[PDB]
Design a protein around this ligand. Sequence first.
Ligand SMILES: CCCCCCCCO[C@@H]1O[C@H](CO)[C@@H](O)[C@H](O)[C@H]1O
Ligand SMILES: CCCCCCCCO[C@@H]1O[C@H](CO)[C@@H](O)[C@H](O)[C@H]1O
Ligand SMILES: CCCCCCCCO[C@@H]1O[C@H](CO)[C@@H](O)[C@H](O)[C@H]1O
Ligand SMILES: CCCCCCCCO[C@@H]1O[C@H](CO)[C@@H](O)[C@H](O)[C@H]1O
Ligand SMILES: CCCCCCCCO[C@@H]1O[C@H](CO)[C@@H](O)[C@H](O)[C@H]1O
Ligand SMILES: CCCCCCCCO[C@@H]1O[C@H](CO)[C@@H](O)[C@H](O)[C@H]1O
Ligand code: NA
Ligand code: NA
Ligand code: NA
Ligand code: NA
Lengths: 509, 509
Amino acid sequence: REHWATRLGLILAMAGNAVGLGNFLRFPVQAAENGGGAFMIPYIIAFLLVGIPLMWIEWAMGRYGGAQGHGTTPAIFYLLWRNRFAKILGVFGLWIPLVVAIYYVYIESWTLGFAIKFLVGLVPEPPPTDPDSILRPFKEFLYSYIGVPKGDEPILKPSLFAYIVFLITMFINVSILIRGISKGIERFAKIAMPTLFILAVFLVIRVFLLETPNGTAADGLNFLWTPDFEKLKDPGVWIAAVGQIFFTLSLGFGAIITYASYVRKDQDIVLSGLTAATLNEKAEVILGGSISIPAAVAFFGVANAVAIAKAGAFNLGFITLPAIFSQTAGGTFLGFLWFFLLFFAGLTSSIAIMQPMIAFLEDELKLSRKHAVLWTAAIVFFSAHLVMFLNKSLDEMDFWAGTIGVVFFGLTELIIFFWIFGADKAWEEINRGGIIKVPRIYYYVMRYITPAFLAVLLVVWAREYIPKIMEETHWTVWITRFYIIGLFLFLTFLVFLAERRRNHESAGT
Amino acid sequence: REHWATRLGLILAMAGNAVGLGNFLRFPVQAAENGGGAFMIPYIIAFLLVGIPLMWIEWAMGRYGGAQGHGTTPAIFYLLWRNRFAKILGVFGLWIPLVVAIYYVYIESWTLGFAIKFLVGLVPEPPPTDPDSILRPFKEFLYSYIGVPKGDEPILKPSLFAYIVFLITMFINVSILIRGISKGIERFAKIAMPTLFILAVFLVIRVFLLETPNGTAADGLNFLWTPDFEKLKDPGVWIAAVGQIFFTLSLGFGAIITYASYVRKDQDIVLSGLTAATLNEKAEVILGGSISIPAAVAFFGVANAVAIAKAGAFNLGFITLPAIFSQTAGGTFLGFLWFFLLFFAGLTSSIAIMQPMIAFLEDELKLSRKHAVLWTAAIVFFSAHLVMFLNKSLDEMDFWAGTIGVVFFGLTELIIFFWIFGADKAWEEINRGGIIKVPRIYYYVMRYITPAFLAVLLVVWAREYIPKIMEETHWTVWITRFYIIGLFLFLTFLVFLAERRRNHESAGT
Ligand SMILES: CCCCCCCCO[C@@H]1O[C@H](CO)[C@@H](O)[C@H](O)[C@H]1O
Ligand SMILES: CCCCCCCCO[C@@H]1O[C@H](CO)[C@@H](O)[C@H](O)[C@H]1O
Ligand SMILES: CCCCCCCCO[C@@H]1O[C@H](CO)[C@@H](O)[C@H](O)[C@H]1O
Ligand SMILES: CCCCCCCCO[C@@H]1O[C@H](CO)[C@@H](O)[C@H](O)[C@H]1O
Ligand SMILES: CCCCCCCCO[C@@H]1O[C@H](CO)[C@@H](O)[C@H](O)[C@H]1O
Ligand SMILES: CCCCCCCCO[C@@H]1O[C@H](CO)[C@@H](O)[C@H](O)[C@H]1O
Ligand code: NA
Ligand code: NA
Ligand code: NA
Ligand code: NA
């Protein structure tokens, strides 16, 4: 079995897994919608009670499974819990990352397409001036790229350029993954993360120089970092914060687990895990947090920036920021650096969420890496056509897998590892080989606090928010639900085939 | 490997494979739309130049493959042509029957649901009287059952009863298939075919007693059996006739092939094949032809009957016939016998088109029969939800697999067997063990006439009819196209897994 070559490569790869579109696109919108500073208190608490503990748990499960030649949850869950039901629940650790990949790589492809067009200056030119005469050209630019419906039919019509760029993005993901863990993902991480970090710091600096009659970047910062103890009572904020914590750390994706399955049995996961998690948080609250919001607030003021963020999920990153930049010297090139940053942030994440499927085909069905990577790419590529052509399909997939799914799976994996497998066996398994030990307090956090935290969260989520969303949707949501349910059935069938092959090889030898 | 126990069981099973909804629902509509007697000339010629020759070819390929432990075309095509491309083209022999099964079993489920409701007298009661005040109650009856859209959304809403009946139908298919070839399909065939034949003859007789001021059943017969040599110049009729010949004989479904793979290597296929084919033709032109049309013409006259048939595909069988019967003494029970006939005609066919998938999982992936049957049922059941809830999804699947697909595959299998494998090897392979030999003339028919016939047909089909259908469809057709293309990808992946398992077991031993 492959292993990470160096500890640095391991850290940077795990950091690249975590640090992605979530830091630069998702986090700003989440924080903005939920009151900025008001969002941060629950966010910080979530990182301490959920983010950190689950990270260690997933590193441990991965290293544990890897030692026995298994990198994905269908098998790993079965190792911790000898029950057929464990294999079925383990399917989510293939399904979630696959479904997420199906829309994530497409969004990643947009960042590359924009980077290219901004580089070559093939971008809209606003009139040299109300705020809308400047934004509109950029809205139309995005709308033409992805092909937003101009009529009543829920159908998207992406440009030829967007389509070809998606193919190129898939090709780029494949070229890295096909070279494996050490020579592929690890090598690229060593190049991608430093580059990523530099671009971000530069962008932060540039943004900090923004000033208009409407305000400064500093106004944005104070909005994000001013505690609002009155919102800490609203369940919606807590749900938003925990959801972002999950998505941001790649928890519940089965991705941290699969990566960790390439960590040597004895190699530390305590300090490495904590480091990777801390790296992500810095990139998120310091880098991601200091770019979009402050730029928006500088040009529009707090109130307007919040409305923009609430307007859409891609408004701030694909429309508003480039529009703002176009009003500054060298702004088109600054737009390029922004989208190039997003692309590298996307790329190092998409390889992470596709690897679980790759590891499964290799580990359980004994496919060569080449075949495992190509077939995986083929499923993601084909499935992505639903996201490219059906309006809101992306939203539906992001909800069931990337929102509900990850939290459900986080709770599931904790229960299995800390409750069923044994709290003391899990605790010892996490600390084994540790350069440092986990503080004793975290034993009771993991065993009692985290699970109770997630369970209550899911319930309150279930009672007050899921009924509204389920009942009010357009009928086309069922197309996506139907398809991704079929995907789960498909993966269940593969796990079944894997156990058959296993039983045959066992009797044969 | 399983084999058919008796020659009678073999014949009746193959006859049951062929004789189905096609004889009693499809044929009447096809003949009616295309001028009745005008349709028959091309139909007869198609049976002689396509039906018969391809039947022998598929029996031969099946027996040939079975002798080596292979019942489906991915492997069988590879035996006749050692090329990776043969395995890929062979996927259609799994895909076509699977896609057809996905809508066929659902339609079959309607016949059972209607049979039940007609038996218990839970049917509409027309006013004791314009023709429309009688038909309408029965249209609404069907429309409520399957849930025809009442608004603008292309969404179906089948009744709870219809849904539960589909589950029961799947269960019934499974209960037969799970017992295998001899104890399952063969046993049931021996019971189903005689019953089927008796019900049909009775219905024909009852129908022949129908008379109204508008005419008699005899008027219908003369319309069907009066040659119209002026339509024999219209390509559309030829296309209709050949399509019906294919669907009717189950050619291009990979179903005849899989059944024949259970015929012993030495056992005759010439006389058996011809007998099975002739049995079907009798059930079609004599039985199927003498029920719906004559009944419709008796009550409405020729002109009206043709318009009714053109109106829809299920109008004649699910609305018009029961409506007509309701005007006769014991008509509700006659309706029951009609739908019971359709159900048994459906059932013996659906087990035939699901067996190829079953044989593949058994033959190539080494699944037990139980698992192969259950997983197959699960794919068909799940996939059928598209056909149950998306308006016109059924039409789309029937077109690509059941119409275009079967003809394309018929030509493909002939080329592979008679051209690539060797015309003389194929000829000798067909005649081997024959109780009778194929007339020498059919060698040149198979080698030159049939292929040229199908090729020209497909071309004329392609130039004049496919562009219209492709261009004019509602956008929702892409949902079905997307799904069934994914199904093809899925089956291709299984064939890939099968070749890997094969290569591993070969090296292991
Ligand atoms: C392998 C699965 C193929 C499914 C059908 C894919 C059809 C893609 O079609 C392509 O879409 C692009 C984006 O709109 C267009 O710009 C191109 O002109 C068009 O050819
Ligand atoms: C680095 C990847 C570059 C991809 C270049 C894609 C070029 C798209 O091609 C262009 O598409 C336009 C819209 O359909 C057409 O108007 C142009 O004629 C055509 O050249
Ligand atoms: C809710 C989670 C908060 C984690 C903060 C942990 C800070 C470390 O806390 C320290 O842990 C050591 C080892 O257990 C002890 O020896 C120290 O007494 C304790 O202060
Ligand atoms: C395993 C795949 C499940 C996909 C969702 C299936 C939902 C079926 O839902 C059922 O449909 C019937 C027909 O309209 C209704 O009569 C029932 O009330 C309804 O529960
Ligand atoms: C042989 C199989 C019998 C299946 C019986 C299905 C009975 C359907 O059940 C009925 O459905 C109706 C419509 O939703 C409701 O109005 C009735 O209350 C309910 O009993
Ligand atoms: C177009 C297909 C028509 C098939 C009709 C075949 C009728 C049998 O034809 C007979 O075949 C025998 C064996 O080859 C010959 O000995 C006879 O001379 C010939 O008349
Ligand atoms: Na992140
Ligand atoms: Na990344
Ligand atoms: Na038939
Ligand atoms: Na049948």
